[PDB]
Amino acid sequence: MKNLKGIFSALLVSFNADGSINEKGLRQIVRYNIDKMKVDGLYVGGSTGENFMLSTEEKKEIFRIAKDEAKDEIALIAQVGSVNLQEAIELGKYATELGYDSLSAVTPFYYKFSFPEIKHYYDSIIEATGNYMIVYSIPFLTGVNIGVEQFGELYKNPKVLGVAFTAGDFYLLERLKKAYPNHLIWAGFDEMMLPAASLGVDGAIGSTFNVNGVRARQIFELTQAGKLKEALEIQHVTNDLIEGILANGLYLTIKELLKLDGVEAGYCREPMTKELSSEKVAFAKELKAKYLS
Amino acid sequence: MKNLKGIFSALLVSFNADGSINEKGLRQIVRYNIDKMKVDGLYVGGSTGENFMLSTEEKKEIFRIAKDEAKDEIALIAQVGSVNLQEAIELGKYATELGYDSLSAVTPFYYKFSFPEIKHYYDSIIEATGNYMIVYSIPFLTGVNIGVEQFGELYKNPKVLGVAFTAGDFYLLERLKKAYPNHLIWAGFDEMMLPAASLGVDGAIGSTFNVNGVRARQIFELTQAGKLKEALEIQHVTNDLIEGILANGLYLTIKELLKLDGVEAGYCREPMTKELSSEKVAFAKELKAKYLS
Amino acid sequence: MKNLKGIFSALLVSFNADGSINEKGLRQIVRYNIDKMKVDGLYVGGSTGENFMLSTEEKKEIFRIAKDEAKDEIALIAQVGSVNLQEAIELGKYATELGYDSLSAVTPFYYKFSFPEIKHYYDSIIEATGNYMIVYSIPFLTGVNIGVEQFGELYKNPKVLGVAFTAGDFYLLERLKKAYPNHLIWAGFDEMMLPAASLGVDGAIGSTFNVNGVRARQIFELTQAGKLKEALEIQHVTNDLIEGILANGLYLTIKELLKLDGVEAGYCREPMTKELSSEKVAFAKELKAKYLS
Amino acid sequence: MKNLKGIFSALLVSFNADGSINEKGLRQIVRYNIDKMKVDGLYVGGSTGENFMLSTEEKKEIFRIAKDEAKDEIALIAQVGSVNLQEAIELGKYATELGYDSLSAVTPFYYKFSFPEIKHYYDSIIEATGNYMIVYSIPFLTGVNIGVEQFGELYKNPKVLGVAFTAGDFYLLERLKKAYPNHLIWAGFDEMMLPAASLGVDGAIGSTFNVNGVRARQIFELTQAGKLKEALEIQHVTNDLIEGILANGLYLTIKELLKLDGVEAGYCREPMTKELSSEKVAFAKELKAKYLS
Questions:
Q1: What distances in angstroms separate CA D237 from CA A281, C227, D192, D198, one per listed residue?
Q2: CA angle B19-B20-B21, nearest 5°?
Q3: How many CB atoms lie within 10 A of CB D97?
Q4: Distant-in-sequence, close-in-space partners of C125: CB < 8 Å, separation ≥ 6
Q5: Chain D residue with Cα closest to C224
Q6: Residue B135 — φ and ψ, nearest 5°?
Q7: Domain A1-293: which CATH class?
Q8: SS3 for D135?
Q9: CA nearest to B129, candidates B104, B163, B154, B107
Q10: Which residues are CB-neighbours of B225 under 8 A, at least 6 positions away?
Q11: Chains B+C touching (3+ CB pairs under 8 Å)
Q12: Count of B-D CB contacts under 8 Å
């Protein structure tokens, strides 16, 4: 029954140097998001979580640890999608049993699945788990484009709540809000939060909210209250930080900014580069001084 | 001199059945924009004016008729860009002698020009004419993407005013406003006016403003005033109309909507389809009844 | 150190309705390829094997069955790549222990891995197993493009043998053969076999060879012998069959063509469509009559 | 009725420093192609001729000069396509009056014309001139893709002889040859001449033939004779040269290679870079020493 509107951090995961999960570090990341970034929720097992590089057992362990640490303090969404639909169903049942408030699932990728195959994949996860479902749309990684009529076909299933929209088409975004006004949209591009919020999205899911969740909430709330001059000021500073993060290496730089606040956010998981070079550590420290001190 | 902020219709041109310019009809389009749509200005010779399908002599005739009809009641911007730099210089001189308030020029297209070639093109037109210049960026037609640092190089020429930004990258849009706060941005996607206006663009240039200019100004002014809930209601209705216009054939349907108000907006120019089928005439009359009566 | 040149079928896998592997049917597919299609080898665990939709245990089982059935009568290459490098290493070690003649790995996908990350991926699989490696390049699924210099960086590891080139850039193909004449290339687009063979590729790996292996060998051998007129006639017939297969649904139609020859090639694995409609079964029977009877 | 099969240089044009046509230089380029490169024909007014940067009067001047110089010694094809259909008709009339053996036209670009619009553009040019037509397809500059069925619809007009195929899709190329065996295909990618000739194209139109026409003919004739091994050697040397030419700047490097053989090939036309830098001149001399004796 939890309210799923608002600000969700896409949870990063602390890894050890061999790619195993650092449980102590992961708990610190969850606590930091709840207590310091003051998020409304966590989106667990998404792209940001380095999810698609992991085994099924590692994904389950992440779901277990996040929920045990968070308890019922905040809303939790579990991304369980994959090219492997039988894995998605297994993970979806697990996360449902642990009490995740909704599931979410990336459009299946690699192969060029037809729309009917995509709709069957969502319907299958829903039927096996009995849980709510949020479509996770990220066309710049998957190459999958879903149009207005196709969203409506997905929404014929009453357990589909809406879409986590990590997409840059704001005409599509407005058309979704017009066609399906009771369905939810979470914006997925942190550097375009202000314009997405201007179109009445219901929340946002972001990797950078792990370190910049305070400003993110401001942008969102001020935009929806009509305080655009102030919201734009804060989006400008946010995007100076994001531009730095992206140039330096997104996941590693957010983890370095966490480490600089005492959170043991650990290594990245190979095949991503597992650690920053010394010059890039220095650069991350300059970002910390300029934007998060 | 003139203030160049606000609502600019991308001027449609009335053609006869043989592709020649219908002067009476083109004057009627100009008068309708000034007197009924209440635009701040016209952008003449743009994609919307079917410009790239015409001869240099036809382009000159359009510039002459628009300026003669409008006189100084509104601001006028002349788009003079081409793959042919010598033509762009000739049209830029001609429009400047007519008293156009600024020039503008599409990034040169077809050949894959390098950035230094593109910059030389802008500087050459400016030096030859002595007039102001607005960069016209339309990557979805030209395939040219100009980054933040590159716009900065263009803006080293002090006669460059800004960019007519017919592009959907709202991260780039924000970054341009951060880096070059005194340079102007005009939004070019009518269906995304609200989110562009929320990022503080200075104006908008739009084909649909030839018939929907009243709503277009409302969206823009309400957004500027932080009245987002009301602006969004009007963007929604505007986008029902635009969706229908796009589906039925953009330029011909805008022309039909003008003809239904007694403006003799004429044929389209081949190789675009020159007239609407009977069924598409009926569809345009249904749009008129639903959205513009 | 088996000869890896010549004709390899990309092994299809027989599935039951519940998505499990039908072992009897998979053994039949292996036997048909060896005994009737007269392949030089099999490429096991590739895109064609529906590999990316499967669990680690399932991939292991396919490797075990293929090797138990084929023994040492043909060459076997094990595709073990994934977004999960730890799984790739686990499957690489497993296929090495089973006695596969080389490993192969798709470029890691979904995330936008840098080139250094891609090379570290190949090196980590090789150094953890000590086996040979064939780069599997399929830009139209992964969006990864590797240039000539980057191939040379990969080839600095002496256990990299060459590339399974499921790509359409015949300029790149020629430059690779020029730059690395001792390294091997297997053509991956069955419908462009003749032109790839004319540039001196060493072999080909193809899904359609599971049913069209007789013609495929003819095209390859006739081209190498300079008998282009005769090779072209056979490529034209092959491409009539391939055009029909693609239109009807690639994997399901190859499987139906196998079933029509008494091979229990089974269902496809969800989220792919698992079975042909009645109309498409009839269309496949027509292809069988026209091209394979 | 002239035979249009074989080797066609895409004629470069000699410009003065101010962008005007250097007639003396252009005649020398024509004579070099006929007398030294021993071409079958010239393709005049194409991409290579810097055509799309020029005025109608300049395009006419080039057609007049090329014909006056070539007389009846070789075949001549006039590319007259443009976004401006009226201009294309005017040029096609003029080239027809001058005696060009066929017209050719690029698919209309910039705007996103529909297929019925593209077909009408070709039929309009043909029906206003009464001359033959070659479709000029170059998706990498225009973004226009035409499929096999669509070619068939173009070929419904009996004056359409076939297609100048500057495209990399060798499956499409095969399928066109199969579907329309009496219609001609000229390859437009000089660096893929061998694999195109392997599929039975009737000729080739190329920018590099202005300087490498001897090897180009050898690759083409040896491939049609099944002498693949020798053809492939010469394609390798050819592509070493082409790689250097592309790296150094295509149009300017071909012109410099002409100048090094005593042909006054002139400047390029702005907005292309008009002259090679001293360092790039030196690189061109190294290419000359290495590949063009």
A1: 47, 24, 13, 18
A2: 120
A3: 11
A4: C80, C81, C85, C88, C89, C92, C103, C105, C133
A5: D228
A6: -70, 130
A7: alpha beta
A8: strand
A9: B104
A10: A226
A11: no
A12: 84
Are D76 and D42 a contacting pair, CB within 8 Å?
yes
Find, among A43, A47, A36, the residue nearest to A6 by Cα: A43
Which of D175, D228, D239 is closest, CB to CB, to C226? D228
The 3-state secondary structure of A67-105, one letter per residue: HHHHCCCCEEEEECCCCCHHHHHHHHHHHHHCCCCEEEE
Asked if A192's CB is within 8 angstroms of B243's CB, the reply is no
- Residue among A153, A27, A136 at smallest CA distance from A77: A136
| Residue type at position C217 | R
| Experimental approach taken | X-ray
- Cβ of D228 under 8 Å from any chain B Cβ? no
One-letter amino acid for residue C33 of the chain: N
Residue A250: closest CA among A280, A220, A286: A280
Residue contact C174–D229, C-beta within 8 A:
no
Contacts of C125 in chain A (CB under 8 A): none
B7 φ, ψ to 5°? Answer: -95, 120
Q: How far apart are CA A187 and CA A202, in angstroms?
A: 8
Burial C20-38 (b: 16+ CB within 10 A, else e): ebbbebbbbbbebbbeebe
The closest of C129, C131, C140, C83 to C106, measured between CA atoms, is C83
Token pair 């977004």 is found at C83
A 241-280 near B (Cβ less than 8 A)? 243
Interface test with C, best of A91, A112, A272, A275 (most C CBs within 10 A): A272
Q: Is A59 helix (H, G, I), strand (E, B) or coil?
A: helix
- Select from C58, C84, C85, C280 the residue whose CB has the most chain A CBs within 10 Å, as the one to mutate to test that interface: C84
- What is the Cα–Cα distance from C206 to C199, expressed in whole angstroms? 18
Tokens coding D25: 């230089």
C227 CB within 8 Å of a chain D CB: yes
Which residues are paired to A204 by β-bridges?
A: A7, A187
Query: Are C159 and C131 a contacting pair, CB within 8 Å?
Result: yes
Q: CA B117 to CA D270: how far, in whole Å?
A: 8
The 10 Å CB-count burial string (b at 16+, else e) for A130-165 is ebbbbbbbbbebbebebeeeebeebbeeebbbbbbb
Question: Before C271, cis peptide (omega within 30)?
Answer: yes
Tokens of D243: 């790689």
Chain B contact for A232, CB < 8 A? yes
Q: Under a CB-based contact definition with an 8 Å cutoff, are residues B83 and D141 in contact?
A: no
Structure tokens at C222: 């006739």
Chain breaks in chain C (C to N over 2.5 A) after: none
Chain centroid to Cα D58, Å, comes to: 18
Q: Residue C136 in contact with residue C107, Cβ under 8 Å?
A: yes
Domain boundaries, chain B: 1-293
Token output for B46: 């743009």
Contact A80, A104 (CB under 8 A): yes
Whether C125 and chain A come into contact, CB under 8 Å, resolves to no
Asked if the Cβ–Cβ distance from C240 to D178 is below 8 Å, we say yes
CA torsion through residues D164, D170, D173, D174, sign: positive
In the numeric block, which tokens belong to residue C241?
Answer: 């069959």
Is C85 in CB contact (< 8 Å) with chain A?
yes
Structure tokens at D21: 């046509």
